[PDB]
Structures are given as structure tokens and as C-alpha cells.
Design a protein around this ligand. Structure first.
Ligand SMILES: CC(/C=C/C(=O)NO)=C\[C@@H](C)C(=O)c1ccc(N(C)C)cc1
Ligand SMILES: [N+]
Ligand SMILES: [N+]
Ligand SMILES: [Zn+2]
Length: 354
């Protein structure tokens, strides 16, 4: 029986930066983890730099070289290149941080799949779930979890990987990468508002269920109203994700754990209590024998994000689930979105058919 919860963090995550995506995100998460006495209960795991071969599992050779050459670029060359991407800034140390950010999750995948640890959480920036095979996007250079997913498949002989994205933003990067791939199931719960919320993509609706052999293995649930709560996410997990999850039977679960959906986040617009992420985390522990790795994505209110991380951490540590301040009943708008997605993937999953 594997035991212990891995925690990867290195000061290098704070060496690149009004802007919402800042080193303050990660530094104050670690501080709240300590003062809550959660940090000392984790097994501290070293970070490592991702190798080129590992990056090439997801990203193109030309893109990797362009990103590597950003190290020596002038702040005007970084200005030029970054302007050709959607919502992306560049920094001389972005490449190093991005490399250590990916490797941090690979470190945790190794420990969980070799049963040295039960589960893990990398407090890493830059985030990844928006990054694509040949381009930067949404403050992401490399796709942390996509790389980790195929890494586990190659190195640790994993057949099926489930990726859960509860960040308020749609991880179109992950969706694009495994679009035709049935070995990796992608689930994304995100604010959409019929395309008026960033990234403003039609591919972010529940209509996109994948293509080819990957049909049915891509699941988007789009909120079309702000102010969603814990009762909405829990109902969404209970009626959609988890039925599919147990039918899918993954051997590793990766979580794009952004916390911009927590109450008080300026960007998300939702009202999800921090304690809700303790429940969602706990649900996912019943899948893949608890083999569960979380990686930081979004979240822009420093205290709310820190609370979300702590709440997720307690469940990783096997602490009792917390009391929920909000109602257990979901709203009508949430039910509409859940119904629509279920209807869109109905013929692909037996468990959805009632
Ligand atoms: C991309 C993103 C977060 C994604 C996320 O968190 N994914 O999980 C937020 C965007 C909309 C944003 O707010 C923004 C702010 C400033 C800016 N520039 C000053 C250029 C460009 C974009
Ligand atoms: N998401
Ligand atoms: N997929
Ligand atoms: Zn986000």
C-alpha cells in the first residue's frame, strides 16, 4: 500500500513575471500551506528540468527550439514574439521555469506510479493547460499535464489516463493535443457564456467530443451563467464525470487544478467555496486506485487560490471532508449545461444512458 502525499515546489517558480499571473500566486500558496500545518505533512519532492525528448511527446521540434532561443532574446524580441500569441508574456527565465514546471509533474508521476507515494500536488508556475503543440497560449509555454499524461504512458506503461480540468478556463491546449487520442480522456468544466468568455472558442462547447478514434473521449461542460457554486460542480461530477470515469477505468488521474473558480477570484466570476475542491479531490481518489496527481493552473486571487490548494491538499492527505457552506442543490442553468453535455456524449458512454 502506497502512502504519503508529494509536494513539489522550487524557488525558481518565482523567477519570472499589474499582471495577474505573477510569482505571488505560488509564494503565498506555500505560505498558507505551512501556517495551516499541511506542508510539514507532505513528502517534499525535488523538481527537475524536462528533457527535450519528453517535450517532444507533445510539442513540435521547431517549437521547442524557438522556445529555447527565448532565453537569450532581448526584451524587445520577447515583446515581438509574445505579441503573436493569445494572452502571453515572455521573460528571459520563462523557458527555465516552464521546464522545471513540467518536470515537477513528471517527478510526481514517477513517485505515484512506482507506489513510493499515494498521490501528489505540484505548486508550479507557469501553468500549462492552454499550451499547444506549436504555440504559446494563455500564459502557458509547455503543456504540463499533456506531457505528463503521455510520459506516464511511455515510461510507466500506463494504458489510460484521465485528465480533469476544473480551472474556470477551457484547456483547449489539452483538448487539441488528445483530440484523436482515445487513450487519454479529457474532461473540462469551464465558464463559456456561449463563447463570450475567454478563450472565446466554439471548440469549447460540448459539441466537440473528439474526432476519429477519440470521439467520445473529449468532454466539455460549459457554464453559460456566472456565479456557479459547489452544488453545481458536485452535481456535474456525480452525474457526468465519475460515471464516465469508472467506465473508462483510468490508471492515472491528472488534474488541471486551477482555482480561479473559487469565490472572490476577479477572473473566474464563479462562487465555488474552497471546501468544494476537497470534495472533488476526494471523489477522484476513488478512481485509479487513488493514483492522483494535481498541478497548479489558474487562480488570481492570492488567498482564494491558496485556500483552494489547501482544501485540495487535506483530501490528498486523507483528512475528513469539510462542511459545505453552500447548498447541495444545483441551479437550473447548471442542470441545463449538464443535460446538454450528457446528451452530446450519450451514445459513447453506457453509464450516461438512463
Ligand atoms: C489568459 C487568462 C487566464 C487564463 C487562465 O487562468 N487559465 O486557467 C486571462 C486573460 C483573459 C486575462 O485576464 C488577461 C490579462 C491581461 C492580459 N494582458 C495584459 C496582455 C491578457 C489577458
Ligand atoms: N477547465
Ligand atoms: N481525448
Ligand atoms: Zn484559468
Amino acid at each position: 500500500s502506497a502512502t504519503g502525499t508529494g509536494l513539489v515546489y522550487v524557488d525558481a517558480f518565482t523567477r519570472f513575471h499589474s499582471h495577474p499571473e505573477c510569482p505571488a500566486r505560488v509564494s503565498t500558496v506555500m505560505e498558507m500551506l505551512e501556517t495551516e500545518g499541511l506542508l510539514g505533512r507532505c513528502v517534499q519532492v525535488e523538481a527537475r528540468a524536462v528533457t527535450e525528448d519528453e517535450l517532444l511527446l507533445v510539442h513540435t521540434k521547431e517549437y521547442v527550439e524557438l522556445m529555447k532561443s527565448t532565453q537569450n532574446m532581448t526584451e524587445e524580441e520577447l515583446k515581438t514574439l509574445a505579441e503573436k500569441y493569445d494572452s502571453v508574456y515572455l521573460h528571459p527565465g520563462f523557458f527555465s521555469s516552464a521546464c522545471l514546471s513540467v518536470g515537477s509533474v513528471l517527478q510526481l508521476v514517477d513517485k505515484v506510479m512506482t507506489s513510493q507515494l499515494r498521490n501528489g500536488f505540484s505548486i508550479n508556475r507557469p501553468p500549462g493547460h492552454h499550451a499547444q503543440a506549436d504555440k504559446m497560449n494563455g500564459f502557458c509555454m509547455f503543456n504540463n499535464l499533456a506531457i505528463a499524461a503521455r510520459y506516464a504512458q511511455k515510461r510507466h506503461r500506463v494504458q489510460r489516463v484521465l485528465i480533469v480540468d476544473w480551472d474556470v478556463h477551457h484547456g483547449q491546449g489539452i483538448q487539441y493535443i488528445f483530440e484523436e487520442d482515445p487513450s487519454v480522456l479529457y474532461f473540462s468544466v469551464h465558464r463559456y457564456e456561449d463563447g463570450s468568455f475567454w478563450p472565446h472558442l466554439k471548440e469549447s462547447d460540448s459539441s466537440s467530443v473528439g474526432s476519429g478514434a477519440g470521439q467520445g473521449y473529449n468532454i466539455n461542460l460549459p457554464w453559460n451563467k456566472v456565479g456557479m457554486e459547489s452544488g453545481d460542480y458536485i452535481t456535474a461530477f456525480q452525474q457526468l464525470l465519475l460515471p464516465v470515469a469508472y467506465e473508462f477505468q483510468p490508471q492515472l488521474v491528472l488534474v488541471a487544478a486551477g482555482f480561479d473558480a473559487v469565490i472572490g477570484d476577479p477572473k473566474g466570476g464563479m462562487q465555488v467555496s474552497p471546501e468544494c475542491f476537497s470534495i472533488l479531490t476526494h471523489m477522484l481518489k476513488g478512481v485509479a486506485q487513488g493514483r492522483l496527481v494535481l498541478a497548479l493552473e489558474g487562480g488570481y486571487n492570492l488567498q482564494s487560490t491558496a485556500e483552494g490548494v489547501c482544501a485540495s491538499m487535506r483530501s490528498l492527505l486523507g483528512d475528513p471532508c469539510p462542511h459545505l457552506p453552500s447548498s447541495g442543490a444545483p441551479c437550473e442553468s447548471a442542470l441545463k449545461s449538464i443535460s446538454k453535455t450528457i446528451s452530446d456524449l450519450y451514445p459513447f458512454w453506457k453509464s450516461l444512458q438512463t
